[PDB]
Amino acid sequence: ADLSELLKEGTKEAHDRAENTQFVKDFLKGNIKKELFKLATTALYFTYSALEEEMERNKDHPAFAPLYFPMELHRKEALTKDMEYFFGENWEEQVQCPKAAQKYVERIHYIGQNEPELLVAHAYTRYMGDLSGGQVLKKVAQRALKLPSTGEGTQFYLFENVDNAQQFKQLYRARMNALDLNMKTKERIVEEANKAFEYNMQIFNELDQ
C-alpha cells in the first residue's frame, strides 16, 4: 500500500490525541497570552532548527533527497524573525529550549545521524500539517495578541515561496510514495511518526502547566 495511506491511517490515533490537548484547544479559542505564545514559539524554533539541520545533512541521501525543499518549506528563518519580534535583537540570550522539546531535538539528531530513512516520518508530521493549518492559526494569533498587521510575529505560518499549498502538498505525497522502500522500512516510518506525535504531545503538555 501507499506510504501516505499507511501514515494517514496508522497515525490517526496519535494525531487526534495531540490535537485534543488542552493547549491546542485553548489556542483555537483565542485564549493564549503573549508570554505563553512566546514559550510555544521558542519550542518551535529549536525543533525546526534541529529538523532542518538534519534535512540539510541528508540532502543527498537516496532515502530522503526527493523531499528536500529548503526554499518551499524551511521555517528556521521565519521563526528567527518572530523571535526577533517578540524578544528583541538579543533574543538568543533570553531563551532556553524547554525540557520536553530538548528530548525531541535529541531524537531528531539521532534519527538524522543514524537512521536517515526515517527522517521523512518527522518531516511529514511537521510541514504537511503546517502547510494546511497555517492561515487559520495565523489569524487567531494576530487577533488574540493584537499583532501588527504587517505580519510581525506570525511569519512561521506563511509559506511565502509556495504558490498553491494544495498543489505542492500533492507533489510531496507523490514523491514520498515513490521512494524505493520495502514493506518493513515503511512500517518503521509509521511508528517513528507516532513517536513524533508523542513528542509533540509532551511539548504541548509542558506548555499547559
Q: Cβ(24)–Cβ(18) under 8 Å?
A: yes
CA distances from residue 1 to 6, 17, 111, 190, 192 in whole angstroms, order as listed = 7, 25, 24, 13, 18
User: Grid cell 506525535 — which residue?
Assistant: 197
Q: Residue 141: how many CB atoms within 10 A of its CB?
A: 19
Domain residue limits, the chain: 1-209
Binding-site entries for heme b? 15, 124, 169, 173
User: Grid cell 510555544 — which residue?
Assistant: 40
Q: Which of 121, 120, 3 is nearest to 63 (CA)?
A: 120
Binding-site entries? 15, 124, 169, 173
CA angle centred on 35, ends 80 and 152, rounded to 5° = 40
Q: How far apart are CA 137 and CA 48, in angstroms?
A: 17
By what method was this entry solved? X-ray
Of 1.20.1740.10, 2.20.25.90, 2.30.30.100, 1.20.910.10, which CATH number belongs to 1-209?
Answer: 1.20.910.10
